[PDB]
Design a protein around this ligand. Sequence first.
Ligand SMILES: CC[C@H](C)[C@@H]([C@@H](CC(=O)N1CCC[C@H]1[C@H](OC)[C@@H](C)C(=O)N[C@@H](Cc1ccccc1)C(=O)O)OC)N(C)C(=O)[C@@H](NC(=O)[C@]1(C)CCCN1)C(C)C
Ligand SMILES: Nc1nc2c(ncn2[C@@H]2O[C@H](COP(=O)(O)OP(=O)(O)OP(=O)(O)O)[C@@H](O)[C@H]2O)c(=O)[nH]1
Ligand SMILES: Nc1nc2c(ncn2[C@@H]2O[C@H](COP(=O)(O)OP(=O)(O)OP(=O)(O)O)[C@@H](O)[C@H]2O)c(=O)[nH]1
Ligand SMILES: COc1cc2c(c(OC)c1OC)-c1ccc(OC)c(=O)cc1[C@@H](NC(C)=O)CC2
Ligand SMILES: Nc1nc2c(ncn2[C@@H]2O[C@H](COP(=O)(O)OP(=O)(O)O)[C@@H](O)[C@H]2O)c(=O)[nH]1
Ligand SMILES: Nc1nc2c(ncn2[C@@H]2O[C@H](COP(=O)(O)OP(=O)(O)O)[C@@H](O)[C@H]2O)c(=O)[nH]1
Ligand SMILES: [Mg+2]
Ligand SMILES: [Mg+2]
Lengths: 430, 428, 429, 430, 123
Amino acid sequence: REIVHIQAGQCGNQIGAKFWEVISDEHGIDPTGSYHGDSDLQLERINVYYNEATGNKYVPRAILVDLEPGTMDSVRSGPFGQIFRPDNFVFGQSGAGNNWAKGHYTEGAELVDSVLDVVRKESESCDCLQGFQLTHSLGGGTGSGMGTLLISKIREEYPDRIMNTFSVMPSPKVSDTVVEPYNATLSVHQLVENTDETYSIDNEALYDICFRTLKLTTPTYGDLNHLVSATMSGVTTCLRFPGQLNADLRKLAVNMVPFPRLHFFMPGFAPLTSRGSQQYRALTVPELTQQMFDSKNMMAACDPRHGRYLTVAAVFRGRMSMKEVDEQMLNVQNKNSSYFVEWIPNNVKTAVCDIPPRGLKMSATFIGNSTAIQELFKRISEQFTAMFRRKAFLHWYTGEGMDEMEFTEAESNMNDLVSEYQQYQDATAD
Amino acid sequence: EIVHIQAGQCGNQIGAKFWEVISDEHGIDPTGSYHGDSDLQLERINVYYNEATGNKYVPRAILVDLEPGTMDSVRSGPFGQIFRPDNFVFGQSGAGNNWAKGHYTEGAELVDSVLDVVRKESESCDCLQGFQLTHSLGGGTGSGMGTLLISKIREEYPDRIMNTFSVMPSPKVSDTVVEPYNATLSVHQLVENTDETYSIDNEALYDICFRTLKLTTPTYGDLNHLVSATMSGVTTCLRFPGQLNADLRKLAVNMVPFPRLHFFMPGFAPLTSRGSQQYRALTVPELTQQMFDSKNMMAACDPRHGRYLTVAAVFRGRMSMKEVDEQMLNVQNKNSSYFVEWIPNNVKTAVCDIPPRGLKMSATFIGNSTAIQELFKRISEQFTAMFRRKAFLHWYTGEGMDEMEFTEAESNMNDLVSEYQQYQDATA
Amino acid sequence: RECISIHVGQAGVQIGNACWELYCLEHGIQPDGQMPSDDSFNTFFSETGAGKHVPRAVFVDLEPTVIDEVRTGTYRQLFHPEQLITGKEDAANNYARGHYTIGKEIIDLVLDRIRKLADQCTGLQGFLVFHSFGGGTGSGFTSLLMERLSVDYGKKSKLEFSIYPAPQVSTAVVEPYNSILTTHTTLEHSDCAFMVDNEAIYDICRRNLDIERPTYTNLNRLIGQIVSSITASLRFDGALNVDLTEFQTNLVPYPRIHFPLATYAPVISAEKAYHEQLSVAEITNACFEPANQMVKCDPRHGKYMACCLLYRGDVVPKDVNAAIATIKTKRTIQFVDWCPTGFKVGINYQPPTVVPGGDLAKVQRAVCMLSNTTAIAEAWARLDHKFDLMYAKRAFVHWYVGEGMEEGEFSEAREDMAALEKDYEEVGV
Amino acid sequence: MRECISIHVGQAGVQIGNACWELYCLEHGIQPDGQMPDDSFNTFFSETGAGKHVPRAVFVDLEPTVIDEVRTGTYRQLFHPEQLITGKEDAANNYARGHYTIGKEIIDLVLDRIRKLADQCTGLQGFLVFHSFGGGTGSGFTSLLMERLSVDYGKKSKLEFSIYPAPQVSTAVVEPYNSILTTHTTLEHSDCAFMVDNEAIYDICRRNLDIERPTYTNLNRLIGQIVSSITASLRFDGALNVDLTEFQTNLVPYPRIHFPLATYAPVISAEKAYHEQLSVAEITNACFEPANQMVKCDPRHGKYMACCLLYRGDVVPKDVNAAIATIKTKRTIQFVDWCPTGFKVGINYQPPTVVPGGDLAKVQRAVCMLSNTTAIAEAWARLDHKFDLMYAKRAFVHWYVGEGMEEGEFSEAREDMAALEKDYEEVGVD
Amino acid sequence: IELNKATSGQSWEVILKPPSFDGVPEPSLEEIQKKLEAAEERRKYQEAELLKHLAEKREHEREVIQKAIEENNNFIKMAKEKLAQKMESNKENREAHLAAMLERLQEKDKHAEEVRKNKELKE
Ligand SMILES: CC[C@H](C)[C@@H]([C@@H](CC(=O)N1CCC[C@H]1[C@H](OC)[C@@H](C)C(=O)N[C@@H](Cc1ccccc1)C(=O)O)OC)N(C)C(=O)[C@@H](NC(=O)[C@]1(C)CCCN1)C(C)C
Ligand SMILES: Nc1nc2c(ncn2[C@@H]2O[C@H](COP(=O)(O)OP(=O)(O)OP(=O)(O)O)[C@@H](O)[C@H]2O)c(=O)[nH]1
Ligand SMILES: Nc1nc2c(ncn2[C@@H]2O[C@H](COP(=O)(O)OP(=O)(O)OP(=O)(O)O)[C@@H](O)[C@H]2O)c(=O)[nH]1
Ligand SMILES: COc1cc2c(c(OC)c1OC)-c1ccc(OC)c(=O)cc1[C@@H](NC(C)=O)CC2
Ligand SMILES: Nc1nc2c(ncn2[C@@H]2O[C@H](COP(=O)(O)OP(=O)(O)O)[C@@H](O)[C@H]2O)c(=O)[nH]1
Ligand SMILES: Nc1nc2c(ncn2[C@@H]2O[C@H](COP(=O)(O)OP(=O)(O)O)[C@@H](O)[C@H]2O)c(=O)[nH]1
Ligand SMILES: [Mg+2]
Ligand SMILES: [Mg+2]
């Protein structure tokens, strides 16, 4: 019934801030922190991500963490900025400098205990703490390093709580930090080990969407971050907004996760939109259903048709015919039957929210456990194994403490996950 | 003097019907006061009724049930006021169509308590004849507790005679799957404990109501109307003064030739309808041959399948013993193969010059026929169906019993049929 | 000269009621005991201090009803409360119950009322025992009584008045069992036993008396008339049969054959137009036709060994011997080798008394006959086969063995009941 | 006297109970205050000094939501705050949580309200356990409580109303695990269980109440109608007949063979108008169409070991016998050799009372036919297969195992089913 | 021929053909009671033997109502004892999982130290 939020590094805070902007508006809250919405369903499950305060005011339950005032300050002098409790901002001046070892081991650890002090506070003032939510860059230092350092330390203190992450996978198409596959692979190692579920926001898909579809020639971060938040409101829809269910991170986890290592989701959303552009021609029900099982709409650059879905959860928003939905939902699975594991009876589940997102009359989210997600991990292993072969940029890590075998440790652990994903892709009933 | 216990749903409704028919014959109006015309009634009124002095009358009736329901029906019933309040002995946990509940666990809890009423009610009598138990053989209170109560009484009053009006079950009337289990278990206890037992087959009562009485929907009231007739019919000799002059033990001595062979086939003529219409009387020959014919038996057997060991017959109403005796000698001469030649004068007649209520003639029959083994094979067979596969046994084994009691109770009834046979074939 | 009339069981008890009814009528005794204006009547009446003549009779039953019907009747005053002994439950058609069960209980007390009835005697001859045969009481107790009476009154007489059973009369299915076990036990004891075949009395109350369904009363009205005709000489100052030991000699030559066949005339009704009354020649011929016989067994085919013609009233010896000469003329009438072909005739000149307001007719003349005939074996053989059928298959036996008897007692009784029938052969040669 | 307590186990269990209890208040003209403007209904309710008729029932759930809906709902005063038990932490659609982890933290309190309800019982007949088959609470908690009453109340009558999973009506991939897990653990501790296959409930509304999208209520209002017809014979002493426990004697041949099949009739929507009405002979034959069944199975193929007709309203033996007459010629009603070919018939006075603002219309003469057919083992077969499929791969299993549960409990619980499956085989042998 | 004469009676023999053959021939109280006391012995014993077979039955019922009393109690043992095992095995089990996961984490927290050590060793 209560989710504690943590944003890490640049991306972490960048995506977190937008999520908070999106969901405050979605809940009818102003930058100051005072309610104004008409429907009292906005206040229904507000207790989840928000704190009740003096003057009946609301404050997001989130810990702002980074090893540089940079983004930290951009957030404060941003739209909602004042809405956050400034005591939660745990900001060093070190700068992990897109180095996992600086975040996870050295420069991060010093701040980690200060961070926890705040988490232990936010966890305390809770009727029932559900679990934690992390938004972080898998290629940076603070996000991927200190972020996963934070997970492991939170995981010690509260093993009984759901660990959920929004892990944004790097792309050579979006960054020239050559070491990124090093920080990526090391972070995946931690994720496969200490998080209940992870939504794989891949910077490759985010770009190609913003480029090939949204047609924005030189996509800005704002252009990407917007899609991130579109899926983040979507995934968290029934966690926040009321409905038939019930509305638990754990219930979702138990239903969505058949095997414990395999918990990386392929987020998808329809309709795709250009940041801050007024919509006109609305979508039909089969458009949303078709345009949701489209590789074209997946936040992680992998082809759902290349693999097989183990579990799928599709959240449609805004008032529409459930019969039209159920009719279509069943067309899709009964036609594309090859891409659904026969050994997981009734693998597709659909939720409908009457409350839609701002500027949309109809939206639809997709969460999927398709084995196809290996295409993501594979991509990174090659990127890593290319440089590691040649011990490239490695001294940045060794001189930060870090051992050499720890790299080969994470590389082969990643290679296990790949094979593990294929094992079940192949696997049949007979 | 006589003590009358009524056990279970069946036995109580059965019992209250006897107690109302005989109270009409004795002028004991629902309240408890003699109003009858002739004092011929009053003569042998001490057999069934006591005095409140008064000069009110109380039946020598003990009421038993392991649940209130039926006790209250009697209370609410017309002739219910006449019963001694301190005589209704009932539990709350229904025994629910389980012989093992009524006979063991549940019964035991009310037995001692009931026995006290019989201890007391037996004190009031100068010299008691014995006991009368009316009950169902497929139930639990009646079927199990009644047989329990019998064994208890036999122990307490060994010299006293055990007479029962035991109603045999049937699938034509009652859907309770378990019935052949209770029946067998209870038959086994009667074979060894009662002195005379009146076999009332429900198969036959339903068949009479149906084929013969043309009643499309036979209700218990109709099936029970037939029983009250056959009760007041066989108890004409105990309640009515004449050249008989008999008792429970005299009847038993004369009817029962071998111990275990003591189950009787009640008969009645005419088979009247519950209500309509009473018009047109019967001749003597009509009344005799009807009564001897299988279509008039309360037990479902064929007298022509066996051989009668002994026969008893109480003709009521104004007639002539010449006419009557002339037909009895006619029958025995005509159907000579079905009367055991090795028991001289094996048929007894009795004529009472009092007819029952409404009808101006009656002819109640009792026959110790070897043919009754048919009624026992009928049950023993029904039992085995379930038994070979041990179906519905769990309800009984749960009560504390063992399969051995079922094996024994059947084997004992199989030995009875084996015995009833021995004599059916036997000749001088 | 005194005489104790014992009545065991319902038949004998009911029969005793009709006996003393006629006795008190014939002697003018009122149902209270007094008799206003030969003295031999006293042979049966013990006069009290209050001038009343209480009978020398002890009534016995194992259930109350019947003796309780005496303390109801007008003749309730006639007897003391001690002489009417009643139990609570009868020997329910069971000999073994009457004998070993309820018997053992009531014996001593029954013998006491006899002792104290006999503690009034200047010369008690014997006892006149009255009973049934097929009754639980009129077989079980009676036979037990004769047993102890024989020890307690050795050398004193016993005159059995037994009622042989019949199907046309209220009979029971066990009757032939009781009938044999009794006779076996009441044989070495009885000195003379008068059988009354209920079969004959039945139709005699019909063919001659016009009553189709005769009541026990009507049946007994006749029995008492024949019973009183036997006792006439004992109750009066008569010549023939002046004592109990007279029949025992005059009729019983061979001891086990102590069953004389009785005969009675004139069997006559009242609700019929009056005419000329029967003569000595009329009744004597009627005395020899089995259409008036007591026990149904062919005299015409069966050797005699005795005969006594006991007349009553308006008779004269010449006409008696004139009516005797008539029969020897055409009828040869058989007799055993060792026996004289002749009868001891007796006339008690007293008037034949009938019940006032009865079905019987007031006749000035009457007769009776005491005749020991081998034909009386035809009566036993009837009862012997009835016993024979049931005992083979052991039908009803369990009731008897349940009352303390032994299974052997049936064979023992049937061996003796067969022995007796060989004695009817050994005699009727 | 003849008292009986009803125990409701989360969501399905609670919601169903409310439909039951509201209908009961209507049946015995009771007002939602406990007050009311025959005494046989006191076997379910209990009168206090003020003349308040509180039900002999317990509402239990591991989380608050559903029981809170009752605590504020249209009948808030009809119960005790003590007799309405709740947790906070849900069973997360996991049996292992429902049974162990979360369950243990309430059981003791729960059993106490049962004991306090048990005290006011002059002569307790037994218990009625309304639970889900696939719910974390409905499965885990129920079995724990059922095991605990077989201890506390020893060999006392434990009756059940199980809610068989249907994909059409919600579900969650794991449900068949929770289904088979509870089926197993409850078996020894049950007396007689009434299954309700949610698809057959769905199918009926769709077909007769003409509801294209059946709401939970729509189903429950219907379910409560069938359940009430079963318990009619307890809260009503109608001379006519009405006699449960007597039915149970024919219904339960052997102890493991305790699943009667309900075939309710007539389900008619308030729209028909001049349809008035069905004859006894019509509704009798209605019970023989597999379209009216509570659990989807085929007893035309299946053998029989009991048939019990529970009539209610305008019923006269004449035509019931005439009805039973015709059916007895229809050569599809084939019984076993060891079993008689009879029908235990019970009739009630009080006809079915209908809910204000309902879907169904006031029927003059209703029935429900309980029967012991081997065709029920199809429900087991249906469930066992889906189980096998996921178990084969040990899919989701880790969530159970993670809450304590040994890997063997699943196999044990499956062989037990396989045995019961084979037991219905064996029994059907002639 | 003549026999006797009296007040209210008279008698005389009346011969016809005399006998062809001049010749003719061709109880204790103790042993009554001895038979009666043997008879009662019988009656009293078989009725006393009956009372033994009835007392035999009274014991079966005494054992049967007892089997049922134990049958439920032995069952409550099994039910209570199983539940006790299950909650324990589970308490044991769930706790070994939780303990081993924090041990893995603590070991992974150990590595961190020897790394900041390998950084200072390099420095
Ligand atoms: C074959 C015997 C049946 C079980 C009867 C009967 C029950 C009965 O007599 N009952 C059960 C309540 C009372 C009674 C009757 O119907 C109200 C009344 C008139 C009566 O006779 N009352 C009794 C009172 C009474 C008797 C016994 C016990 C308790 C009360 C009386 O008049 O004295 O129904 C009429 N029957 C024909 C039936 O049609 C019943 N059907 C069945 O059981 C069938 C079809 C027939 C046997 C195999 N299966 C059922 C549909 C009611
Ligand atoms: N003629 C005649 N025979 C009688 C009379 N009463 C009974 N009997 C016969 O006696 C026989 C039965 O013997 P009972 O003496 O009556 O029976 P019981 O068992 O000895 O005596 P209770 O049981 O006390 O009546 C049958 O043969 C009857 O026909 C009677 O008054 N007159
Ligand atoms: N017929 C019917 N089925 C229901 C109802 N509520 C839930 N279900 C079914 O119950 C199953 C899911 O189990 P639940 O009872 O919801 O779960 P629970 O663990 O008992 O309760 P929670 O604590 O809320 O999770 C699915 O098969 C649903 O379709 C209802 O009111 N009616
Ligand atoms: C208490 O009621 C009765 C009691 C008895 C009898 C009887 O039938 C007429 C009764 O009426 C039913 C009786 C029965 C059967 C006999 O033989 C089969 C017999 O010989 C003799 C009898 C009875 N004796 C007579 C002479 O009828 C005595 C016992
Ligand atoms: N989508 C998205 N990616 C970002 C954003 N900021 C940085 N990144 C990505 O994050 C990776 C580097 O991590 P970064 O957030 O700069 O480092 P940190 O400050 O140490 O967490 C690269 O792959 C960048 O593309 C952002 O706001 N949005
Ligand atoms: N003829 C008749 N049979 C009845 C009556 N009541 C029930 N039965 C039969 O009784 C049996 C069931 O036993 P019952 O006396 O009702 O139950 P109990 O209370 O356990 O003795 C079945 O064979 C029924 O057919 C009745 O009054 N008359
Ligand atoms: Mg007698
Ligand atoms: Mg749950």
